[PDB]
Amino acid sequence: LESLSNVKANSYSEWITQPNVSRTIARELKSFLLEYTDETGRSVYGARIRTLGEMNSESLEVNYRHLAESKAILALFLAKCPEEMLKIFDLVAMEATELHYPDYARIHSEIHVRISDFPTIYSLRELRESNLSSLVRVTGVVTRRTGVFPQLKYVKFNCLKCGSILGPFFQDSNEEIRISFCTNCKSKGPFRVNGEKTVYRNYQRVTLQEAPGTVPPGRLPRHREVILLADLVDVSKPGEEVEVTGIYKNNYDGNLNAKNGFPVFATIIEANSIKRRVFSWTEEEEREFRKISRDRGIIDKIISSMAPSIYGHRDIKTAVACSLFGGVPKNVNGKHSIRGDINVLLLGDPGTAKSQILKYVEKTAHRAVFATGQGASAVGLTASVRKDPITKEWTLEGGALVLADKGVCLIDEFDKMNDQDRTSIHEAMEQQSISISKAGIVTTLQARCSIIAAANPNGGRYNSTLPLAQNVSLTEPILSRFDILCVVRDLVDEEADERLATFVVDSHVRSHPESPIPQELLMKYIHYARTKIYPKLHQMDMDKVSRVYADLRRESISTGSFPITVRHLESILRIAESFAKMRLSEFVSSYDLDRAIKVVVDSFVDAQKVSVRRQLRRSFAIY
Amino acid sequence: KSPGDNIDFQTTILSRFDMIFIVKDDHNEERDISIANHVINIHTGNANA
Numbered sequence: 271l272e273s274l275s276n277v278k279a280n281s282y283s284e285w286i287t288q289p290n291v292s293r294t295i296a297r298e299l300k301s302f303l304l305e306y307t308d309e310t311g312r313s314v315y316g317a318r319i320r321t322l323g324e325m326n327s328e329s330l331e332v333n334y335r336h337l338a339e340s341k342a343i344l345a346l347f348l349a350k351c352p353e354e355m356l357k358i359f360d361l362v363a364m365e366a367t368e369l370h371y372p373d374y375a376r377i378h379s380e381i382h383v384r385i386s387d388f389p390t391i392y393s394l395r396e397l398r399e400s401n402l403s404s405l406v407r408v409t410g411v412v413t414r415r416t417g418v419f420p421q422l423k424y425v426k427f428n429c430l431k432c433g434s435i436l437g438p439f440f441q442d443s444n445e446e447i448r449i450s451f452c453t454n455c456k457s458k459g460p461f462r463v464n465g466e467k468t469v470y471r472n473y474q475r476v477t478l479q480e481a482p483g484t485v486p487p488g489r490l491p492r493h494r495e496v497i498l499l500a501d502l503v504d505v506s507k508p509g510e511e512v513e514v515t516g517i518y519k520n521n522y523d524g525n526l527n528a529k530n531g532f533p534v535f536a537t538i539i540e541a542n543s544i545k546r547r548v549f550s551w552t553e554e555e556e557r558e559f560r561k562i563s564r565d566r567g568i569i570d571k572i573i574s575s576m577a578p579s580i581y582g583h584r585d586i587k588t589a590v591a592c593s594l595f596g597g598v599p600k601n602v603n604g605k606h607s608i609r610g611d612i613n614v615l616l617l618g619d620p621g622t623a624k625s626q627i628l629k630y631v632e633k634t635a636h637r638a639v640f641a642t643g644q645g646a647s648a649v650g651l652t653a654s655v656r657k658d659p660i661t662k663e664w665t666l667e668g669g670a671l672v673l674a675d676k677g678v679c680l681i682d683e684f685d686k687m688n689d690q691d692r693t694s695i696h697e698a699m700e701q702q703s704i705s706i707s708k709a710g711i712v713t714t715l716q717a718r719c720s721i722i723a724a725a726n727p728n729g730g731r732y733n734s735t736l737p738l739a740q741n742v743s744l745t746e747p748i749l750s751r752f753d754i755l756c757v758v759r760d761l762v763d764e765e766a767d768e769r770l771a772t773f774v775v776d777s778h779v780r781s782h783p784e785s786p787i788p789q790e791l792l793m794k795y796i797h798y799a800r801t802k803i804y805p806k807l808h809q810m811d812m813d814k815v816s817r818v819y820a821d822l823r824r825e826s827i828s829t830g831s832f833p834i835t836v837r838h839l840e841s842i843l844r845i846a847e848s849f850a851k852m853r854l855s856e857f858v859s860s861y862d863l864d865r866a867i868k869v870v871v872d873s874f875v876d877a878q879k880v881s882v883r884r885q886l887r888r889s890f891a892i893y
Numbered sequence: 894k895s896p897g898d899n900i901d902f903q904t905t906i907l908s909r910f911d912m913i914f915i916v917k918d919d920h921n922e923e924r925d926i927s928i929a930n931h932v933i934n935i936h937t938g939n940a941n942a
């Protein structure tokens with residue numbers, strides 16, 4: 271035959287299985303792969319198989335547009351009966367690889383085919399009984415996932431009469447296969463599969479749910495089940511929208527039809543291709559990082575890139591950057607631990623956008639976890655032993671503090687935590703580790719994380735006439751574990767009102783339908799700086815630091831304020847380390863010390879009462 | 894104020910311990926300088942060696 275396939279003998283499935291037409295279409299597909307070329311004249315598929323062989327892969331991607339344009343008849347039959355032709359095109363791809371590469375079967379015995387660019391796009395609620403055993407393309411959100419399981423591929427059997435091991439018999443992924451004849455015994459007795467001489471593949475089940483935005487008002491989202499085989503497993507984690515190309519078929523096995531009631535059937539989708547509807551770098555990016563670092567005034571270059579969707583609050587943003595970059599931990603002989611995570615506290619009046627800073631930090635950090643003292647959250651703060659609703663197994667789960675080891679833990683509405691949450695937070699901040707004694711398990715988990723918290727004052731408004739300790743429901747043990755305390759007051763002033771109001775109204779009017787470093791580079795910059803920079807101090811700044819500390823102590827004791835303690839010196843050193851890390855430098859400069867001094871002194875002064883505050887403003891005017 | 898008043902529990906609890914240590918934070922120029930020197934020395938890395 272030669273492009274005479276437009277003639278129809280009987281139903282399509284029967285036609286596609288005749289040996290002669292099977293050979294015809296097999297040769298046709300081989301010619302498609304060997305001959306197809308775009309206008310540029312480059313062997314697109316040639317390069318595809320070349321890189322496949324170079325990387326030692328297992329599958330080939332194919333474009334439906336090219337295949338349609340070239341061989342409309344093959345494209346139509348693929349859309350109608352893809353199950354049959356996938357096999358023959360797999361064989362064609364294998365022989366193509368053998369032609370290009372020798373002895374590829376030595377490593378990989380299969381070469382899967384992935385289709386792409388299917389024209390029609392459906393939703394999970396449109397599938398009906400005219401789509402069964404056909405090719406579909408849908409989209410939805412991933413809601414729940416299973417583990418990876420082994421499925422039989424090349425089964426080998428044991429004869430119980432003679433110890434013969436019958437040879438491999440292919441498993442088609444349709445129904446379990448059996449045998450009934452032993453060549454040696456000529457027998458038919460019992461058989462058992464051989465587990466140590468069988469080859470398996472990967473199996474996983476995924477549930478897709480429609481995207482809530484697309485559901486027309488008044489109705490509820492639908493869902494389906496999906497099957498992922500081989501190297502499609504562990505590609506789409508829960509909580510991301512995806513596009514899945516697969517074959518829509520019934521659960522033909524079912525269980526049995528003796529069940530009473532109407533004879534109805536369940537359906538699934540077997541996935542052929544999956545796609546999504548980073549913090550790595552390279553030499554190209556490393557050179558640009560180093561170039562940007564060498565420039566003067568890089569700290570203020572970075573600070574202006576924090577939370578672009580908010581106006582003002584420069585102190586908040588510099589503190590956010592400092593806590594987002596971090597210092598260097600220390601340990602003297604492994605018997606005296608000093609932490610390197612900088613904690614900050616936001617204490618402001620309502621309508622000051624604190625939650626927006628927390629959301630930005632969540633979206634910009636490498637490992638940031640969101641919790642809260644009130645409301646619904648994906649995770650709590652305490653560790654516990656709890657059942658798994660799908661695997662029916664006990665599990666040990668830590669809180670957001672354990673989960674964010676070597677990261678940042680964000681807590682919203684910090685003033686509304688209960689006793690258990692307060693105890694967990696206190697232990698994590700004091701020891702950087704969480705204990706547990708539950709259900710026969712005694713252990714300790716690491717809790718070395720950075721904390722950014724937001725709260726509200728008593729009564730909802732700030733009383734500037736009293737010390738900060740009397741404005742919040744928190745206690746001294748917890749309040750003294752923060753490095754930077756930020757106090758936001760909604761003082762009424764005009765010029766600020768015009769600036770903020772114009773910002774807000776313009777932002778709204780842009781979003782009606784009808785200097786700073788780029789963020790995507792900033793993410794990689796932050797990751798690289800944390801990964802590769804460990805600045806160090808010089809003993810020549812000791813005199814300056816000691817003199818400043820003595821001055822602070824003397825003034826604080828004279829003015830009858832909250833005591834200045836060595837914790838402030840350690841915070842200053844940590845912030846200086848972070849400022850040095852900002853520059854990619856390996857040493858702590860004097861300018862970084864000056865910036866840290868300013869930050870800590872301003873934080874301390876801003877948190878006192880009006881009389882003490884104004885007294886301390888004059889004394890420390892040097893900074 | 895008496896040490897019993899300074900604590901936030903029944904004063905008979907203090908009767909259980911064997912040794913008590915009330916450490917006060919008195920301000921002093923030379924002591925502050927010495928402690929600062931010690932702390933920056935620890936942070937720099939000399940006290941490590």
Ligand SMILES: Nc1ncnc2c1ncn2[C@@H]1O[C@H](COP(=O)(O)OP(=O)(O)OP(=O)(O)O)[C@@H](O)[C@H]1O
Pocket residue numbers: 579580581618619620621622623624625626726770774
């Ligand atoms: N300075 C600001 N600049 C821009 N938008 C702001 C500013 N302050 C508040 N907003 C906006 O006003 C609303 C305030 O809600 P938001 O949750 O961010 O405030 P909050 O300070 O966390 O208050 P709370 O949690 O006490 O209600 C949000 O729309 C926020 O975007």
Ligand SMILES: [Mg+2]
Pocket residue numbers: 624625
């Ligand atoms: Mg809020």
Ligand SMILES: [Zn+2]
Pocket residue numbers: 429430431432433434452453454455456457
């Ligand atoms: Zn036998």
